[PDB]
Amino acid sequence: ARIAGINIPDHKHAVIALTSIYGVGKTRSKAILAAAGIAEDVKISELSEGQIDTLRDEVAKFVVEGDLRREISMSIKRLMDLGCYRGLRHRRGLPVRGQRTKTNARTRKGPRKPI
Amino acid sequence: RWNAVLKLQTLPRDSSPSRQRNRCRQTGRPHGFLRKFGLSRIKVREAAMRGEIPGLKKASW
């Protein structure tokens, strides 16, 4: 069934099925089933409507999806706008050398590539 | 450093004479010193290889 943000674990145990989530893993898979009181050896197709309900609400309170990916993008954007080499490394569109990369470097690059 | 090496000061603070510690004479490291030589584990080795330490010799197998 569907729990968090876009996830459809089908035909598998309650444990391994939840392991397919970007946020929770094995450690979290066991603790959640123990808190909601659910058999870990039961398939997702054998779970009742009441069991899944208590599973969604609890697993709900967690961090996942886009909102998290934007936090990552921002983290890479902050050191990118500054004078940090690591940020320039993320781009790697910078000079790898020791001569100039800005111009006159076609002897290694080859034909001019589109901007 | 120059501030931590207050050990050089013969007279300890409020603490009893027991306050006086050790500190290496060469590097000035308090971690692991060797009373006999007063040098740290790092300096005793460097001084050993150089041969500046009399009577000292590298043990062999």
Binding site: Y85, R89 | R1, W2, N3, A4, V5, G28
Partner: protein, 87 residues
């Protein structure tokens, strides 16, 4: 790419006392001249003042800052930002 090998540099006149203050927590802001030194664990949480060449600026070291030199957080030149200089 940066360079280290296995000989990270930490001026002894800014690494031994910084450990002193560790006797019972930390100590108020300090001031070091050699920005060449690199930032490491112990220095976390403390406020070290780096010399820009004119004065000492308070640089609150953080775990995320660990690894970079003290000089990287102490700008040499001074640009006003001729404008509304917002954000």
């Amino acid at each position: 790419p940066r360079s280290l090998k296995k000989g990270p540099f930490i001026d002894l006149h800014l690494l031994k006392k910084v450990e002193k203050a560790v006797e019972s927590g930390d100590k108020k802001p300090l001031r070091t001249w050699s920005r060449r030194s690199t930032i490491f664990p112990n220095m976390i949480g403390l406020t070290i003042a780096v010399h820009n060449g004119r004065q000492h600026v308070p640089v609150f070291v953080t775990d995320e800052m660990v690894g970079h030199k003290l000089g990287e957080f102490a700008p040499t030149r001074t640009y006003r930002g001729h404008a509304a200089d917002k954000k």
